[PDB]
Amino acid sequence: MERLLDELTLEGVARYMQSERCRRVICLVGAGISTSAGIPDFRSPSTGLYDNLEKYHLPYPEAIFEISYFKKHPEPFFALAKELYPGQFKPTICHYFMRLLKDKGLLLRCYTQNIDTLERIAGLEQEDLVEAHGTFYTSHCVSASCRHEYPLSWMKEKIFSEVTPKCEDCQSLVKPDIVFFGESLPARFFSCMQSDFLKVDLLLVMGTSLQVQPFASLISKAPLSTPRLLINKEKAGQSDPFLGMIMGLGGGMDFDSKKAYRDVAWLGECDQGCLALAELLGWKKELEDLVRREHASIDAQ
């Protein structure tokens, strides 16, 4: 076992990142990286989306993003979907920190569970990204025998006119290519995962509860020696086993046991943790300038 972190702290991760041994970083992110932009997450008590769906009278909150429920009752999704489209929000410091990794030749990939497109808006390119839970950008008829594609405009025209979008070929429901419970993830997820996780030197895990598979499996795909830094409000991925746990057995993070050797939890807001890390790396001013600049460009156009 190569012990790559000289200590299990942000400072130790930063020293590692500056070494020659840290060539390729994979970011794994979720909704907590966009809450500072004004987008609520899913599972935060009271504020998260799943605590705010009472008006839809769902059997349980996740039903609104579940394919089998959606086929029986598509209306609640499509009413909610008016709010989901991007462009009223700017990327956060955390998004720009990932941009900085790209520009420093350190970003192997950002795997995102989010559909707000803020990674792209912050300037990560298509090849840098795996939008693991899909995209609002395109839509598809739900029938396996048809799968006719529809573009954003056709879906928007339907979403904002409150017309439940039906496919013109087979009259089956049509939906944005956001991944619902029960649906296949994009092929790109699996093909990038296969090669990426053979060669990652650091995993940065930000703003995710790690409560859904297969995304939560990604942390167990890195080599055993690859350090893993979590920047998040709460410890995630570290949990005693129990019946119904999400993670596979032994598949989680070990921050606190007597055997912990490579996992670090920095607890706080993602923006603050990225500033803190950037400071340690000597990038803080560069990062603040990038944010200031890019926020200004956005306000222009």
Ligand X SMILES: Nc1ncnc2c1ncn2[C@@H]1O[C@H](COP(=O)(O)OP(=O)(O)OC[C@H]2O[C@H](O)[C@H](O)[C@@H]2O)[C@@H](O)[C@H]1O
Ligand Y SMILES: NC(=O)c1cccnc1
User: Where on the chain is the footprint of ligand Y (CB under 6 A)?
Assistant: 31, 34, 39-42, 49, 84, 114-116
Q: Which of the choices Na ion, Zn ion, its own copies, none does residue 167 contact, using the CB cut-off of 5 to 8 A by kind?
A: Zn ion
User: Rounded to whole angstroms, how far apart are CA atoms 208 and 129?
Assistant: 17
Please name the residues in contact with 120: beta carbons below 8 A apart, sequence gap of 6 or more: 126, 129
Can 133 be counted among the known catalytic residues? yes
Q: Which helix (H) or strand (E) holds 97?
A: helix 93-103
User: Rounded to whole angstroms, how far apart are CA atoms 85 and 244?
Assistant: 33
> Is 216 buried (19+), middle (13-18) or exposed (0-12) by CB count in 10 A?
buried
Of the candidates 28, 179, 200, 253, which one interacts with its own copies according to CB under 8 A? Answer: 179
Supply φ then ψ for residue 54, to 5 degrees.
Answer: -55, -35
Number of residues near ligand X (by CB under 6 A): 24
Q: Which of the choices ligand X, ligand Y, Na ion, none does residue 40 contact, using the CB cut-off of 5 to 8 A by kind?
A: ligand Y
Of the candidates 2, 7, 103, 169, which one interacts with Zn ion according to CB under 5 A? Answer: 169
Of how many residues is the chain composed?
Answer: 301
Beta bridge partners of 228: 203, 263
The nearest distance, CB 269 to ligand X, in angstroms, is 4
Catalytic: which of 95, 133, 140, 295?
A: 133
Neighbours of 38 (CB within 10 A): 10
Q: Which amino acid appears at position 10 of this protein?
A: L
- Is 94 known as a binding-site position? no
Nearer to ligand X, 107 or 236 (CB): 236
156 within 8 A of 176, measured Cβ to Cβ: no
Q: Which residues contribute to the site for Na ion (CB under 5 A)?
A: 34, 114, 116, 118
**Residues known to be catalytic:** 133
Name the site residues for its own copies (rule: CB under 8 A): 59-60, 66, 133, 179-185, 189-190, 193, 212-214, 216-218, 220-221, 240-251
- Contacts to ligand X by CB under 6 A: 30-32, 35-36, 41-44, 48, 65, 113, 133, 207-209, 211-212, 232-234, 236, 269-270
